[PDB]
Point group: C5
Chain length 263, copies 5
């Protein structure tokens, strides 16, 4: 065994709570997809890539959640008044591997609305993507020791967090350096985004440490709840904020659909 989810038994209540969270996640992401498609038409072409990137992230994350959700119900059966493992195992590594695609998308959509262009765009994009792959690959290896070797967990943890800090650094640099060039009064909004990011992105490394400070079924419940809030904050709500920033700037630049959409 590799994940502590597979070590425990669950009460009907615990088991059903986790099923409730995973099922809700799936539908929020597919629903947000339809919304991004319908309002994409009010964004000026120069910023429409930012909205297209949200559609990518919604579909990708939605499909992973849908897998986790099926796996949860398939791995366990109710037998003698508790849910117990049965012939399949449950892991979180699905998420980790999926971040290899979605974290780039989240970061690129911020650079686009910050109005970076050309060399500066492509350069920052490259550094952010490699830092992120760095963070994710070392995280994935780490979480392979959550049952066996908590020492190893924390070691790879620390390396992973190195890359995190670099990435957060670059992002904040660019934000605070470019906030002033922002149109339509979105300098205020972009700052709220950066906060949202800091909160939501932090929940993930907390979830990564639950094995270390809560190795039991209540820990398991907590980790699944943290992942759920972090996904809805870091992907859906952040996507709504990026899109709203893009429509505001579109209108300021005199794109009429945007201007109409706002009155």
């Amino acid at each position: 065994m590799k994940n502590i989810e597979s070590l425990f038994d669950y009460s009907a209540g615990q088991f059903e709570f986790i099923d409730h969270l995973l099922t809700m996640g799936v539908g929020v992401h597919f629903a947000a997809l339809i919304f991004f498609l319908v309002v994409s038409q009010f964004v000026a072409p120069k910023y429409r890539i930012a909205t297209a990137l949200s559609c990518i992230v919604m579909v990708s994350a939605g499909l992973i959640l849908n897998s986790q959700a099926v796996m949860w119900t398939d791995a366990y059966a109710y037998v003698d008044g508790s849910y117990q493992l049965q012939d399949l195992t449950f892991s979180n590594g699905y998420r980790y591997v999926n971040w290899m695609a979605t974290i780039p998308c989240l970061l690129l959509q911020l650079l686009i609305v910050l109005n970076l262009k050309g060399k500066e765009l492509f350069s920052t994009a490259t550094w952010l993507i490699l830092a992120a792959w760095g963070m994710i690959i070392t995280g994935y290896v780490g979480q392979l020791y959550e049952v066996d070797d908590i020492a190893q967990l924390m070691i790879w943890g620390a390396v992973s967090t190195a890359f995190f800090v670099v990435m957060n650094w670059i992002v904040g640099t660019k934000i605070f350096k470019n906030r002033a060039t922002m149109l339509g009064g979105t300098d205020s909004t972009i700052t709220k985004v950066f906060w949202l990011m800091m909160f939501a992105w932090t929940l993930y490394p907390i979830a990564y440490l639950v094995p270390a400070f809560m190795n039991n079924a209540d820990g398991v419940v907590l980790r699944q709840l943290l992942f759920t809030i972090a996904d809805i904050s870091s992907k859906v709500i952040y996507g709504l904020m990026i899109t709203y920033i893009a429509i505001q700037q579109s209108a300021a630049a005199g794109y009429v659909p945007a201007q109409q959409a706002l009155g």
Copy 2:
């Protein structure tokens, strides 16, 4: 066990009836989605978000119903002339957790067609959303006692209903204060909407009390029927009324597609 659905056995007739209601719910929500997409083009951009919000709700609700309906058939087997539970359990908590996303959407689409703007929009939105999360979270906890502790059910019930009343109060304030500014003769229509809301939204707390006044398989049938009607009324039919209000006001404001759509 946490829900009374899991306590009973069911006649083929009862069991099949409930599967018929759940199956129909799924398809009404996905069907209404196609309609909202096709007629969105007759709504002026200033109101198109209201229609997009219906698309979110139809997809989210549709996918939950689809889960409930699969779980129902999976949790039970026909064995000695009745349907009996088998190795999985059935709960309604799927709905509860999903309301955390859909009730905001329903409330925001009413504000948009009431023509609130700016500070007043954002302020009312915030208070309505927190009231709603309040109502939902305390309801979810409550319904965890429906088998064990009916006292606790009613206590958390009462708190939940507090938040309800605040929310209904704010909504009615805004409606009756802004009915006069409504274009295209939609002051009449908006009043019908507010009624629809009052009826449909009330079915939910009735369904929540069935354990208290009908703890048996006929109760279970009733609760599933109440949920079905309340979902079709509170989401699909209310969505059709909001969209019709939006087309009426679009045309009054001189949006041509809207004017054509009406003749």
Copy 3:
């Protein structure tokens, strides 16, 4: 047991035929959906709702058929050279409950192309919908006696048929009263539609009586065949006729896309 489907065993040929019919139904409805979407652009806005209503009916009916089809293969297994029931039951009540949504849609799309407007539209709509819910609810109750009490079947049958007759009466009134105002030479076409309706809608009450005049597996084969033809006629082919009528009248009213679509 409520339905005679669940009383019999089936030869591989009978069993496979029924699976062939159900599977085909599913794909005809989803296919027709894409067609209605593509040609909706040639309908003038005044009539586009008629085409949108066909999309609703295609998705809703398609998803019911898809359920029936999975249930069929899940309820039975091949055991000693025949298909026999196993641990789940099969019913038709899925269809009945779904008519509560689709029959309104079918009736509304006829009124729209008949060019009814305002009070007359909303009034006729209301009477037709209540008649239809009347017919469907009493039919659903009826078919709960198909195994036990054929007397009761015929009694509720007769009530259901009352509502039918009212509904057919109103429809024909409106058709024959408004045929003359029809544009683009669609007075001829609308009459064909009314015939199609009469044939296709009648198959349903015949299928409802098979228990009474053929209580065996060949009856069961017949009922499934009748439902298949009646669904393709009453929904898909009638949809194609309504849309063709709408494009003809669009062109007559001088909508260019319609005129182009016809040359």
Copy 4:
């Protein structure tokens, strides 16, 4: 048993090959669907129905293949180094019944680009559809004797082939009579289409005779391969040719999107 697929056992290689063919078929048809949607916009409205008809056929055929593919894996299990039948049966009749809808669509899209209009269109359409229903229904009955009575197979074979010949005759008449009126140099292209048709459509009656000249698991492999090629040829590649002919004639008629699409 009705089909010889259900009579044999299969090597892993045979069994896997057939699963490979069925799975690929499904995706080619759903992929071609997206292509027909995206390029439909370069076809003039007078010919856009021809492209819409391809979308119908892609969805319908894709969903049947998807069923066959699931049935294949469900009907057999690997047991003592071979795949053997288990509690479900496998048939081809799914395809037969589906031709009742798709063969009309294929034939109507050819008449549209041949530029037939009005009476001549509706008349030819009617004769071709009834011939085709004739061919398909007699084929279906035929193939019910593939295990029992090869005499009966060939008798119904012969009748089926009667209707074939009529249908091929009418089609060739129309093609060779109308080739000269065709725009944009598509007289060459339309002749290629007619050849493609002759080849692809012939594979079907060959597949129908395999029981007679190869009653074994290698026959079964051959029949599935013949069906796969014939489906890709008769639906996807023919669809791409009809669409290309329609864009060429659109441009010749001075539809600008078509002219742009070609340069």
Copy 5:
């Protein structure tokens, strides 16, 4: 047995890793689909077919991955602390047969943006397609010997690689001959594409040889990882590069949406 996947048992970690890779692949392909649809509108009509070809490839490859991923979890069960085969077998042949459709699409989208036209287009298309079918069919036969006869593997390998070399030769000819006529400074970009192709396309023949140099569960892990990277590189990232080249050349040709999309 035909594939070495079916010969081994797997640790939870090995087994889970492979399920993580397969699951991610599915969602990247369906996600990239939505992106290609949204940005297709910024490509001039003359090049829009190149983008439509990416949509085909994303759906086709997505659906294959989705099958492989279900088969993997269905073929194995966790039993005595390892994953072991159970009653179904696992193969890679699904991919091979799917290349018969996707490799043509990949090659055709490169010719379109290289600006080949008419005779030269249709001629090169034909040679490249037959070369590719040659490479694929001989590969498929080869991989039927991976368990039994590694000699035969390498023989058919060698023939397959013949066709590879021809195909790479033609592609490079055309690229380096037409790089100079490329608009918008895409001569640089097209060269990067050709490199991408060389790397990504080569992984496949390496994966084909793993049986020869790593016949064990770690080899199996390697092959699945190689296929995952090769699919993301050869289809998704290459598609993003083709579409970017198409937007650049569209803008240079004075298509306004393209010019807007770039500023």
